[PDB]
Amino acid sequence: IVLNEQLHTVKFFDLKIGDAIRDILQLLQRETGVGSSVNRDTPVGISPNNPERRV
């Protein structure tokens, strides 16, 4: 049982390397700036957990 999980993760070393590069590829295609007001749940200048959140 131990060796089966140890051999399962060594065959995904190269596939996780290319997975990490594909993270950087979709990262640099993101919309620039701090974001857009259409796609936000939080106001920009404060934490979402601020007690004085809604002015």
Partner: protein
């Protein structure tokens, strides 16, 4: 082309080049197999009391040519630069001529020369079944053997990708396999010769039989190991990719140097003008016509005369 790393994927100039070259597709169309239509038959180019040269022009969409030398006495034939999209006409020609195929000469291991090599060896050995065919090649082309798959990637040759090349199998120059004690079709190929770059006019030849000698000449510039065939009794120079009609080989491919191509053109000046030069691509010419009417040789000797120590000549657009 090359491996798509992180820098090539985040480059906008790469997408700009792939839009400029190929339009809205972005992917290069490969070099496909010639169909059974628009395919010509095998021509007998030369007949002599010693040998017979039989060839076929434009046998690939690389526009390469396929040639075979036949010994009239020993009934032995020899393919040079085995790259034909249909090696079924050649096996039928050998079987209807009662010939034996013993070796295949390879000038260099680019994809326009070794694309159908396993097909040649398999079909001719299957006809021999009703001693195997050897391969004669230069070990510097080892660096072009390993990129046979990548070249099959870019030019769309997908069915020839997953094929172990016969030059990669264990010859007599290699260590042997230590098989379990409880097979020899692919484990050992005893008929294999490796040509040496130290080519001379004394002993660098192949005994073709009947006193016909084929002198292989080491001439880089288009490849790290590039071997011409020279038959002085027949005045025939299989140049391969070094020299063509009014043009020379490319240097804009990897492992290709212009000054090596210039030295390879300079080691050709001791042959007579009536030597018919037979190129891997296009129409055949003579060496005197290339001394008179080829601008690459004119530029090479002009740069040599005006005092260039490193004369670099070579094409950037032409035949692979």
């Amino acid at each position: 082309s090359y491996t798509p790393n992180l820098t090539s994927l985040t480059n906008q100039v790469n997408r700009s080049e792939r839009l400029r070259k190929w339009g809205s597709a972005g992917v290069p169309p490969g070099v496909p197999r010639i169909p059974r239509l628009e395919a010509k038959g095998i021509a007998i180019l030369h007949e002599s009391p010693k040998v017979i040269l039989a060839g076929r022009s434009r046998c690939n969409n690389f526009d390469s040519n396929q040639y075979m030398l036949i010994n009239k006495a020993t009934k032995r034939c020899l393919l040079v630069d085995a790259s034909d999209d249909w090696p079924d006409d050649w096996a039928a020609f050998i079987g209807a001529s009662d010939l034996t195929l013993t070796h295949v000469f390879l000038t260099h291991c680019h994809i326009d020369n070794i694309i159908n090599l396993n097909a040649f060896l398999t079909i001719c050995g299957s006809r021999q079944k009703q001693d195997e065919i050897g391969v004669m090649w230069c070990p510097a082309e080892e660096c072009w053997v390993q990129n046979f798959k990548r070249s099959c990637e870019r030019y769309g040759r997908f069915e020839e990708m997953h094929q172990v090349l016969p030059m990669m199998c264990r010859s007599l120059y290699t260590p042997q396999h230590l098989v379990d004690p409880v097979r020899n079709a692919r484990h050992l190929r005893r008929n294999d010769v490796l040509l040496s770059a130290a080519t001379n006019r004394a002993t660098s030849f192949i005994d073709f039989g009947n006193g016909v000698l084929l002198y292989y000449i080491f001439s880089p510039g288009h490849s790290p190991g590039h071997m011409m065939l020279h038959i002085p009794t027949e005045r025939i120079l299989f140049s391969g990719d070094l020299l063509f009609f009014n043009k020379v080989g490319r240097v804009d491919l990897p492992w290709a140097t212009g000054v090596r191509l210039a030295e390879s053109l300079r080691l050709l000046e001791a042959l007579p003008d009536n030597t018919v030069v037979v190129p891997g691509h296009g129409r055949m010419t003579t060496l005197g016509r290339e001394r008179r009417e080829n601008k690459a040789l004119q530029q090479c000797y002009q740069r040599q005369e005006i005092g260039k120590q490193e004369v670099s000549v070579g094409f950037n657009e032409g035949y692979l």
